[model samples]
Structure formats: C-alpha cells, structure tokens
Target: ANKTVVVTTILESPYVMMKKNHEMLEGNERYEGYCVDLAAEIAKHCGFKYKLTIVGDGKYGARDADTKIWNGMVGELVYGKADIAIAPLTITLVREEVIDFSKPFMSLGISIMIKKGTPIESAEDLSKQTEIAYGTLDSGSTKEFFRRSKIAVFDKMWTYMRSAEPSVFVRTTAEGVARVRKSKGKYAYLLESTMNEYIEQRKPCDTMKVGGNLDSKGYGIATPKGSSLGTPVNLAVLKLSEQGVLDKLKNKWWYDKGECGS
Candidate 1:
C-alpha cells in the first residue's frame, strides 16, 4: 500500500490563502497561493498521494513556550498528525530536534513592519522609546530568535519585551499586521522578509517598510524523523530552483500586478 502523506498547511495570505471559490477548483487547484501551488507541485514530483490539512494553530513552529504544547505546521509533524510539513516554516535548531527539514527552498530574515509614518527607521530605534512597542507572530521563528539570541541587540530586544508594561504581542502575522496598521505608529511587527515583500503590495491599507532583515535563514520542507521522502522532495525543490521555476512562481504570485494592476 502506498503511504498516505498528510501535508500540514495554514491560511496565511499570498502563501496559503483559500480561494473564495475554492469549492469549485478542480482537484488540487482548490487551495491557491505560493505555498499551495508549491505544495501541489512537490506532491506531484515526489510521487505521493497527499491531502492538505491546515495546521491547528496559525503559528509557524512547534511548541508554545507558554502552553508547552505543539502548535502550527511544526506541531502537526512533531505529533505525527501529518507526514509532511510544506508550510513556510523557517528552519531552526530547536525545531530540527523534533523533526527533520529538507534543504532550504528559500532564504529570508527577520524584518519589522511598521505603519507608513512610524518613526523607527532601524532595529536600533526599537529600544529608544518604551511606548513605540513591537511584537512577533506568536510561536514563530521570530519569537525563538529573541529567545535564543546571544548578541547584544537581540538581547536588548529580549529585555525590553520581557519587562514591558503593556505587553506587545500578537497571535499571527495577520494579527500583527492588523495591529501595526491600526495602532497609528505605535506598534511594529517583526516577521520574515518574504512576508514583508508579499504584503507591501496587498491592498486596502497602509504600507510596510522593512527596516532590514535581522539575520539570514531559509525556509525548508519539514518531515517527521526518519522519513524517506526527504531526498525526493529536496531533489524536486532543487530542480525547480535550478530551472528558474521557483522564481517564476514567486514572481507570478508576489510581483505580477495584472494589466494596469497595483
């Protein structure tokens, strides 16, 4: 019998948003986005029968430090709820402990999103004013960055958040974006550069200026420990990267504004 692969996913926009007409999309076309499209292609290339199940929590990694339980895409794979994790989850050492990630499919870094007029211009600016508060996507790689940082800057950021009075935090990137958009220059969001670039073009609201990418890392396809699918999946991803198919897909969804488009 062929092994059934369960692909854990999430509803993050421009990456894994559900089509308003998803009910009508044929077969794998039902869910659409950069990640959705990539997931379908990976399944096809890996020669596996797969089902897409949105992750239980919107967070990106495993185990909420506060709750001490798994959440997000990482959670599903860690708990054996899914055979594969194809979400845009960043690879980190902590996560690598419970699951194995294939070679990086894309590189990114931690970045901050602020309201158009927010005074902060760089990471250094974040610590200047106590009220100019910031937070990250809960249970995400950014949170882990602060938690695991050894350098002075990240150490400072960690100190500020830990001792803050009002407590700046959000449950998801969407929530963080919403908070920054509505907070009127008071709130800033720290997230990945890929997401930053993708959202800058999204409509009906403010603009996002990425101060800078904090550190370099990559997003990888993760699977449960000892899975043999890793080699096939990585080969498929690398092939796409080499043939420029991955870049083409990224530009199509992220940059291509249609005729006279925004």
Candidate 2:
C-alpha cells in the first residue's frame, strides 16, 4: 500500500466544524471549515490522500511547561500524531522553536474587542484609564505577544497587569466579551481579528474592533519536522493566493462586509 498522509486540525467556528453526521463519519468527513478547504486543496496538489484530526486544545497550542505534551496543533506534529497541520496556526517565535512553518498564506494581527461604550481608544490608552482593564485570551498568541514584547507600550502593559489592585485576566475570548458586556465599559479582550469580526456581526454586535492590530503575524501550514511536504505545500499556497482561490475561500466562509470588501 502507498503511504497515506494524516493532517491534524481543530474545530473552531468559521475554521472547522463537526459534521451533522459526524458520529457516522471518519477523518475529513467529520470536519469542515476554511482550514478543511485549504487542506483539501493542498492534498490535491500534492497527490496524496489525507486525514484531518482535531487538535485537543481549543487555544492556539503551545508546549506545556510540565508534562510537555504538545498542547496545540503544533503538539500534534511534535508528537508525530500527524503529518500536516492545516489550521490557521499563527507563526510565532516559540512555535517556530517547535515546528517549521510554511510560507505564510495570510496576514493578521492581535486586535482588541471591546463593548461599544468603552473609553479605551488605542492600545496605548488602556493603562492610563484608571477604571478600565484589559486582557488577552489565556494561552493564545495574544497573551504570548505581551509576555514577549520588547516595546515600551507592551512593557508598560505587562507592568500594569502585574500590579493592578484587582488582577485583570480572563480565561477565554468568550468570557472576555461577556465581561465587557456585563461591566458596561470596564474591560477589553485582545484576540485575533478573525474571531473578533465573527462576533461583531452577530445580533448584539455590541463589541467594536478597537485599536489597530498591536502586532504583525501570519498563519501557516504546520508540518512535522523534516517532512518532505514543505516545498510543494508552499508552492501550492502561492499558486492559490495568485489565482484568488484563497481570498475567495476566506470570503466564502468568513466574510462579514460581504463581497463589497473584495
């Protein structure tokens, strides 16, 4: 039999989802999202059949401090559980330490989600506002962004969080949004633009995308160490990007402003 490739992914809305018929299915059959579509494109170009398994952590995965199980999609590759990671795993310094990232197919940044009435106007304005406090999703890239920054604003943010009278931290993006909604203008959650926009279109749409992205980043296809799929995958991504397939897919699944934005 020929070698079959297994790709690992996760089920995040607008990214991946379980099938209505998931219990009766296997592999890709149970998953669907922008990543799923991208995975299928890569597999088609590479001449391979693949499997898509969801990564265990809902958060963008990173190395665990103690037991050291690969906590996110990167973990799947580090542990040899799969051959490719087709999710929108952002390329970060720590992640680069653990896995190889293909040429980035898209660019994004850490954006803030705040309730409509929040007084916070910019990333720089947060610490100065005595009544307002903000946080990032725990264990996500946004958290690591502040933890590893060398810039003045980020350094100040770190200092403020450490000494604030009441520690301001939240467990997830959802909780952070809820906090802002409930507080009437007291908190903000820094998260990926992809998710922030997704929530902005919903009924309440009370949350506004605040402050320009604080950092520059991109998403890449994460492959196992020394995997031979690197070159072809990168090339396929470039081709998809050039032909507008990638943009079309993003619009198809994640677009909020509709086709007018394109």
Candidate 3:
C-alpha cells in the first residue's frame, strides 16, 4: 500500500489531457480526463496510490518491425519504466504477447472519418474506386488491421494503400484529421470510433463518422506481464462497468458538450 503505482498514459483528448490550469498543479493533478478518473477509481478500489505520467515517444503503443522493440506506453511497461498503463490503449494480440491487459474497459473499433459530404460510405466503397483517397494513423492497430487482414476486400485495399502515390499515411491523429478536413473530399481518415465520435462534436463540426467499424476491439488497462496488480485492476474495471461509473464518465467528457447537436 505504500508503494505508488507509476501510471503511463497518452495525451489523447477526452481520454487523457492536460487540465486548463495544469501548470499550477503538481504530480497527478497536472492531468485530467476519463483515464484520470478511472485511474483514481482503480487505485482507490485496489487500495494503492498512483502517479500518472505521459509516455515519452507520444505513441499509443506499437512494435517496430525491424527493431522488434515496443514503443509508447507499451514500451514503458515492457521496459519496467511504469507500473500501470491506463489510456486509449487498444487490446491487440501482438501487444498481448509482450504485456498483460485487463478485461476491456471500453469497446471500440476501427472507423472512418470523412468530411460531412464525402461520396464514400464505407471501406468497401473506397476499395472499389480511386477518385477519393484514404489512409490510417501511421502507427497503431487501425493501420495494422488493414495490413494484417486476410479478407479479400481488406487485402486488396491494403495492397493499394501500401504502395499508393503521395503516401496515404499520417504521423498523428491530428494530421490525419487535418487531411480529411483539408482534402476537400479527397481523403478519409481511419481511426478508432471513440475518437471519431468525439471529433464529430467539436467546433467547425465538418466531419462525420460513416459506415460500420471495420473490426471490433476495446481499450484495456495494461500492466507488465505477470504483474500482481493485473487481477485487482481488472476487477476494478469490471466493478466500475457494473456500477455505471464508466457511462457517467463518458457522458461527462464527451456527449455533454452537445456542440454538434448531440
């Protein structure tokens, strides 16, 4: 109970973010978001104290193909630099191989973000045409989803994306979203649904999430493999899910804005 858990997270909006006056705060008080509240609840329920730290590389987590080393929050966990990871960290089989994940705390899937009036309605539509272009965040599960997919449509689409001219890939979510907004209907950004929906409610509000998600997955609390903290944190997340706490937090940060007409 005396040892403080070092929590690693990313700066994804609504999930984890800097408080408006974060400069005046210290330690964990320097941040706030759904993950902040979830971290507090998990620590309280588990009877342990914690400190939240953002990942140094600024990625959610991914393995470098050539180096075979993990980076981002996952890297922090893999290297013993943090005790727990609570962010919009997707649960993937590859990540699961090197680290442990609690049961999913939030369900999400790969989705498409388009300008409000793009002619494309689905990945299938994009696959069959070349007039408008599309791409995924350069280094996450969404891009991996396309790269590893064996489905006929997805495979074909991946073929096009992997070799497309002008490089249809983005370094960050902000860059991907900006491409979608500025491409004038020539580009679509693939990302997680939770983020797509959050952006739909923001100012200028020119984007809309269209079509069903390409795959089903969720975000989980991650810890180093075989850590004793795994089971207790998993139980805490399940308990919060059952108590409606997760729903309340989602509405408080996301839909409560009502900016895009809810």
lDDT of 2 at 247: 91
**Arrange candidates by lDDT, highest first: which order?**
3, 1, 2
Clashing pairs in 1: none
Score each candidate by Cα lDDT.
Answer: 0.81, 0.78, 0.91
Q: How do these models rank on TM-score, best leading?
A: 3, 1, 2
Could you estimate the TM-score for every candidate? 0.91, 0.88, 0.97
Candidate 3 off by > 4 Å: none
Writing each residue's lDDT as its tens digit, candidate 2 over 95-132 gives 88878888887788988888897778788898566677
Supply the global lDDT for candidate 1.
0.81
The most accurate candidate by TM-score is 3
| Candidate 2, residue 163: how far the Cα is off, in Å | 5.6
* Model 2 alpha-carbon drift over 4 Å, by segment: 19-26, 65-69, 162-167, 256-262
Error of 2 at 167 (Å): 5.3
In candidate 2 the C-alpha lDDT for residue 187 amounts to: 78
Superior by lDDT: candidate 1 or candidate 2: 1
Candidate 1 on 1-262: residue-level lDDT in tens? 7977888887887778878898877545678888888887888898888888887756577675698877777878878888888878888888899889888888899998888888888787896667688887656778878878888878899888866767676777788888888888888988888887777877744757657789999999999888888789989999889988889888888789632246
Model with the higher TM-score, candidate 1 or 2 = 1
